[PDB]
Amino acid sequence: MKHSLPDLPYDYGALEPHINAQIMQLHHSKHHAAYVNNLNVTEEKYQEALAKGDVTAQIALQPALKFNGGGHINHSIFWTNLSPNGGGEPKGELLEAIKRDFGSFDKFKEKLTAASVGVQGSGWGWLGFNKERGHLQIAACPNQDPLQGTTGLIPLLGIDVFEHAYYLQYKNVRPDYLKAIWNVINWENVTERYMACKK
Amino acid sequence: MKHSLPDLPYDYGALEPHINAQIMQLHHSKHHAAYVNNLNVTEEKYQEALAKGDVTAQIALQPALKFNGGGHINHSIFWTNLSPNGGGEPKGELLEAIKRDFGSFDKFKEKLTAASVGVQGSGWGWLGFNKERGHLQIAACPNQDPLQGTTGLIPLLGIDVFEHAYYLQYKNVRPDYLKAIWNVINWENVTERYMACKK
Ligand SMILES: [Mn+2]
Ligand SMILES: [Mn+2]
Contact status of B50 with chain A (Cβ, < 8 Å): yes
Give the domain ranges of chain A: 21-81, 92-197
Architecture label for domain A21-81: Orthogonal Bundle (1.10)
A172: which residues sit within 8 A by CB, 6+ positions away? none
Matching fold, domains B21-81 and B92-197: no
Minimum Cα–Cα distance from A62: chain B residue: B62
Contact B1 A39 (CB under 8 A): no
Give the whole-angstrom CA distance, residue A147 versus residue A74.
8
Phi, psi of B188 (to 5 degrees): -60, -45
Q: Looking at B102-153, which runs of residues are DSSP E strands?
A: 123-130, 135-142
β-pair partners for A12:
none
Residue A57: list chain B partners with CB under 8 A.
149
Query: How are the residues of chain A apportioned to helix, strand and coil, as percentages rounded to the nearest 5?
Result: 60, 15, 30
**B60-66 long-range CB contacts below 8 Å, 24 or more apart?**
B60/A148, B60/A149, B60/A150, B60/A152, B62/A62, B62/A65, B62/A66, B64/B38, B65/A55, B65/A58, B65/A59, B65/A62, B65/B39, B66/A59, B66/A62, B66/B143, B66/B144, B66/B145, B66/B149
- For B87, left (φ over 0), alpha (ψ -120 to 50), or beta? left
Element (H, E) at A160: strand A154-160
Q: What is the CATH number of domain B92-197?
A: 3.55.40.20
Q: Within a 10 A sphere around the Cβ of A193, how many other Cβ atoms?
A: 19
Burial-class residue A186 by CB neighbours within 10 Å (0-12, 13-18, 19+).
Answer: buried
Q: Is the CB of residue A2 less than 8 Å away from at least one CB of chain B?
A: yes
CA dihedral B33, B36, B37, B38 (to 10 degrees): 120
Report how far residue A37's alpha carbon sits from residue A52's, in angstroms, rounded to the nearest whole number: 23
> Is the backbone of residue A133 left (phi > 0), alpha (psi -120 to 50) or beta?
alpha
* Torsion angle of the four alpha carbons A175, A193, A83, A125, in this order, in degrees rounded to the nearest 10: 20
Dihedral of CA atoms A40, A46, A52, A56 in degrees, nearest 10, equals 150
Task: Identify any residues that bridge with B136 across adjacent strands, giving them in sequence order.
Answer: B129
Kindly write down the DSSP assignment for every residue of A102-136, as one continuous string: HSSHHHHHHHHHHHHHT--SSEEEEEEEETTTTEE
Spatial separation of the C-alpha atoms in residues A97 and A87, rounded to whole Å: 18
**Experimental technique:** neutron
What is the DSSP secondary-structure string of B27-56? IIIIIIHHHHHHHHHHHHHHHHHHHHT-HH
Asked if A56 reaches chain B (Cβ–Cβ under 8 Å), the answer is: yes
Report the alpha-carbon angle B150-B155-B161, nearest 5. Answer: 80
State the Cα–Cα distance between residues A144 and A38, nearest whole angstrom: 13
Whole-number Å distance between alpha carbons of B192 and B199: 11
Q: How many residues does chain B have?
A: 199
For residue A197, which amino acid is it? C
Q: What is the distance in A from the centroid of ligand 1 to the CA of A126?
A: 14
B148 touches chain A (CB under 8 A): yes
Residue A7, burial from CB neighbour count under 10 angstroms (0-12, 13-18, 19+): exposed
User: Helix crossing, A105-117 with A92-102: angle to 10°?
Assistant: 70
Cβ count near B36 (within 10 Å):
20
- Give CA–CA dist A19/A74, Å, rounded: 18
CA A176 to CA A168: how far, in whole Å? 12
Of residues B180, B188, B179, B149, the one with CA closest to residue B67: B149
User: From the CA of B164, how far away is ligand 2's center (Å)?
Assistant: 6
| Cα–Cα distance measured from residue B158 to residue B178, given in angstroms and rounded to the nearest whole number | 11
Rounded distance, CA A27 to CA A161, Å?
Answer: 12
Resolution (angstroms) stands at 2.3
Measured between beta carbons, which residues in chain A are less than 8 angstroms from residue B148?
56, 60
Strand, coil or helix: what is B175? helix
